[PDB]
Structure formats: C-alpha cells, structure tokens
Amino acid sequence: GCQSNHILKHNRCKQDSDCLAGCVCGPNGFCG
Amino acid sequence: SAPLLLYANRRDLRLVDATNGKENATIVVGGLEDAAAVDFVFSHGLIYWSDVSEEAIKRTEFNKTESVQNVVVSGLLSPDGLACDWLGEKLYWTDSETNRIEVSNLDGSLRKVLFWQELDQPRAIALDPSSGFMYWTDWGEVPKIERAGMDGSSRFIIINSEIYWPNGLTLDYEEQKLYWADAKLNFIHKSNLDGTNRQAVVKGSLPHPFALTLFEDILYWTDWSTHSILACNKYTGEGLREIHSDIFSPMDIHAFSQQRQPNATNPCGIDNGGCSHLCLMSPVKPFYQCACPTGVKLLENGKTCKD
Numbered sequence A: 001g002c003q004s005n006h007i008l009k010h011n012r013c014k015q016d017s018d019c020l021a022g023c024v025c026g027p028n029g030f031c032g
Numbered sequence B: 001s002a003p004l005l006l007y008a009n010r011r012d013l014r015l016v017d018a019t020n021g022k023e024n025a026t027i028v029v030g031g032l033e034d035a036a037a038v039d040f041v042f043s044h045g046l047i048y049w050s051d052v053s054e055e056a057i058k059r060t061e062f063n064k065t066e067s068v069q070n071v072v073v074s075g076l077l078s079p080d081g082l083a084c085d086w087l088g089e090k091l092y093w094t095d096s097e098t099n100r101i102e103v104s105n106l107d108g109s110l111r112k113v114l115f116w117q118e119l120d121q122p123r124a125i126a127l128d129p130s131s132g133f134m135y136w137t138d139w140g141e142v143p144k145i146e147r148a149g150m151d152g153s154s155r156f157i158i159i160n161s162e163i164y165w166p167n168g169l170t171l172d173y174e175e176q177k178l179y180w181a182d183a184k185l186n187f188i189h190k191s192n193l194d195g196t197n198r199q200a201v202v203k204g205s206l207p208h209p210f211a212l213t214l215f216e217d218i219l220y221w222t223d224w225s226t227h228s229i230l231a232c233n234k235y236t237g238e239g240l241r242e243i244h245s246d247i248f249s250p251m252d253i254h255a256f257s258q259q260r261q262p263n264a265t266n267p268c269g270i271d272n273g274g275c276s277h278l279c280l281m282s283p284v285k286p287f288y289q290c291a292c293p294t295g296v297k298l299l300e301n302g303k304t305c306k307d
Ligand SMILES: *[C@@H]1O[C@H](CO[C@@H]2O[C@@H](C)[C@@H](O)[C@@H](O)[C@@H]2O)[C@@H](O[C@@H]2O[C@H](CO)[C@@H](O[C@H]3O[C@H](CO)[C@@H](O)[C@H](O)[C@@H]3O)[C@H](O)[C@H]2NC(C)=O)[C@H](O[C@@H]2O[C@@H](C)[C@@H](O)[C@@H](O)[C@@H]2O)[C@H]1NC(C)=O
Pocket: B004, B015, B026, B028, B045, B062, B063, B256, B257, B258
C-alpha cells in the first residue's frame, strides 16, 4: 500500500514525489 | 486495573488512561519533530524518547514540575527503537541507517557499539534485565527476531520464518513469553523466549501495527493506518477493541507502571561490579559483564578498561 513502513522515507512528505509511485502527499503531510 | 499507556506521537509524547480511553490524552512533553521510540525508568522518574528528525535520544524528569528536555545521545541517523535497562541503568537503541545496536549509561556516557553486522532495518528492542537478555527485530532483507546477552554475547536468531515486517515486540515477565506484531502479515504471535512453541494470538486483520506492549492479561498496540491504540486478550486474541483514536501519528508505546519494571538485585552490586566503566547485565553467572566504550580495550582481569 501507500503506507510506508519507514518512519520518514516515503512516509513524511512535502510533494507527491516524496511518496511511492502512484501515492499522494496528504493534507496532514503524510503519504497515502 | 488497566494501566496508563505512554506513547510517542511524533510531535509530542502522550499518556492515556486505558480505563478512560475515550478521554483526552495528556501531553508529557511537546514541541518534538518525529518522536518515535519511547521508554521509561519508573523508579528514577525518567521518560526517554528518540526523535528521528533531530537525530537524538532525549529524556525528561516526569516527577518534577519543570518539563525539561535534555539531550542524552546525539548524531543518531535513524534511532527507530530504544529500551531502558531499569536494573543495570543503561540505555539501548537500534539505528536503522548505521545498522547498529548500541548501549550507554542513562546520561549517554560511555557509548559502546554492541552489534554492527547483519543488520538492515533493526527496529524494536525489549529487555529482560534480571535474565540478562535483549531481544530485537529487523524488518530488512532478512526479516528476523534475535536475542543476545545484554552484554553483547551469544547473539542468536530465534524467529526467521513467517515474518516480514516485525515492528512490535514485548515481553510478558510473569508468563515468560515473547510477543510480536507483524505489519505485513497482519498478526500478533507469541513464543517462548527462545522462539519455541510459537502460537498465533491475533490471527489477522491488523492493518499496520507499529508497537506492542502488555499489562496483566491485555495486549495494547499502536496502528499506523487506524491512527489508534487497540487492545485484546493476550491468550485468546478476543475482546479486540479500540482504546483511543484520532491520534495524530501514534508510534512506540508502553504500559506506564512500576509493575512493568519489577524490582530485582543488580548483580553489579554497589561497586559497579568492580568495572572501571560499563557494568552490563549478562545471561551467565555472575550475571554481569564489564565493558568499555567503543574501541577501548578491556584488560585481562575483565574489569578494567585502558584509559
Ligand atoms: C511520579 O509520577 C507517578 C506517575 O504519575 C502520573 O504520571 C505523571 C507523568 C503525571 O501525569 C501524574 O499526574 C500522573 O499521576 C506517580 O504515581 C501516580 O500517582 C498518583 C497519585 O498522585 C496515583 O493515583 C492515585 O489516585 C487515587 C488518589 O486518591 C487513588 O485511589 C489511587 O489508588 C492512586 O493512589 C497513580 O496511581 C500513580 N501512577 C502510577 C502509574 O503509579 C508518583 O506518585 C507516587 O506514587 C503513588 C502510588 C502514590 O504513592 C503517590 O502519593 C506518590 O506521589 C510520582 N512520584 C513522586 C515521588 O512524585
């Protein structure tokens, strides 16, 4: 899923690009 | 008789009453960035935490009025897990970027790297100080649960099948059992402390557990996708329920109680075991082992380091 198991990498985010491919940076600042 | 639950929440640490879980959690310390790991030394009135963005482990004195945050250990690239040895008075942690397990005194002094090989994504770490064993997980390319002496001895893999994202890990000190949560296979299992007699507790449908703790007959865990704290019976996996919800970003968790850090004799006695530097718990008689900071030689007498 878009839920990373890393504490920061692909978890915290600023833009959709910080997330795994096809995942989005949500309004709370986390990928989802 | 449910306990207070202490948990990290990235921006703060919180305490919630497991008997009044619907009510608001109280903030222990605030103004954090990515607080992840948390533990305590109840009899010293200390709470420890890691902040993976500030690359540090810090502590606070929770019986004092002033709510002060003191840096204990800095320069930690990804301190994903920590445990407090409430008996030998030591701090243990994992680092998933430098791929290490390390120990220090409670003030951060005399740091010693214990393991630095065959680690990839080390994460949870739990201690059995009166037995001198430490336990940890690694969710990397070879996922596993391991145990070793708290002195760095006798490292062994105890679980390496049916395992992928072992995030949570705790011990039942009354029943002498290990419990863990796997966030990819979506269950909670238990075993003996050597990994034998593995049994399922919660068989499935745990979407992303991160950390696990225990009190009396109840398991408690945080889940990253539900943003909540759940509980179930530690034998049957039944009575599954949601203790506390709408959590910003729940992380590590403990039952916050003196009863979870049972009093025992420190085998180091009153003279630090005659050790010049570190006196670490050990699983073989006399149940302590002297040690030195990283790179520093222990003389043949087994007590004194080369200053
Ligand atoms: C060190 O802190 C202990 C934990 O306190 C909790 O956590 C901190 C962070 C803060 O949020 C506190 O507000 C919070 O309580 C503390 O133990 C806690 O003490 C309270 C009493 O102050 C206990 O509550 C009682 O509630 C009613 C009162 O009538 C009784 O019916 C209950 O049976 C119970 O006595 C909590 O149970 C206790 N929590 C835990 C986890 O033990 C501790 O206080 C000392 O221990 C308790 C058992 C009593 O002996 C108190 O008189 C002591 O002060 C505190 N220690 C010191 C030295 O300040």
